[PDB]
């Protein structure tokens, strides 16, 4: 029994967006979704934050898959990852939006750049840790590599978001088309680690 919130960077450097919705489809279709099973909410951030749907909006896997396919890329000049994570913690994981007392809490964060608000990450991550939110973080290195930008500081930032052990919770994904390849391992760990 898990409440899972997926936190999606919507910035326009991620391309094609079909790669992200394919990742969502493949990950979510392997779950048993319902008010007494797994619940999924999805938040998208860029420059601001939007709840695509709350944890208790949908009570079946079929419904979640239909909604996930329709999620549009929202774009954004800036990448406010700390705001996205903090909003997932303070808003998505609330009883008002369907969060359940006593279930396992998992956040999955998908991003392709360093965050403009990275000075907030230390506090935001510690607040998630205090609230028992297990964090899987996914760095997509595609746009950085395509722009010949160094990725080492980026990888370090996204690793810092992942729960320990870091190597089980952090995924380095070379490019958008490779995102779907992590689904089997990610799903296994979501339901195996605490
Ligand atoms: Ca970006
Ligand atoms: Cl209510």
Residue numbers in the entry: 32 to 225
What does the original paper state about this entry?
Integrins are widely expressed cell surface receptors that couple cell- extracellular matrix (ECM) interactions with the cytoskeleton and transduce mechanochemical signals across the plasma membrane initiating a biological response. Four I domain-containing integrins (α1β1, α2β1, α10β1, and α11β1) function as collagen receptors on numerous cell types. The bond consists of a glutamate or aspartate in the ligand and a metal ion bound by a metal ion dependent adhesion site (MIDAS) within the I domain. In contrast, while Ca2+ promotes α1I ligand binding, it inhibits α2I binding, suggesting these ions differentially regulate the interaction of integrins with their cognate ligands.
The α1I asymmetric unit comprises two molecules whose structures were analyzed for discrepancies relevant to Ca2+ binding. The RMSD between the A and B α1I molecules is 0.13 Å. More specifically, the α1I domain Ca2+ coordinates D253, S152 and S154. D150 and T220 interactions with Ca2+ are water-mediated (ω1). In total, the Ca2+ is heptacoordinated with three residues and four water molecules. The metal-I domain side chain bond distances are approximately 2.4 Å. Exclusive alignment of Ca2+ vs. Mg2+-bound α1I MIDAS residues produced a RMSD of 0.24 Å. We found that Ca2+ functionally substitutes for Mg2+ in the α1I structure. Specifically, Ca2+ is properly positioned in α1I to facilitate binding by coordination with an acidic ligand side chain, initiating the allosteric mechanism that leads to signal transduction. Specifically, increased flexibility in α1I domain loops βB-βC and α3-α4 would allow for the expansion of the MIDAS pocket necessary to bind the larger Ca2+ ion.
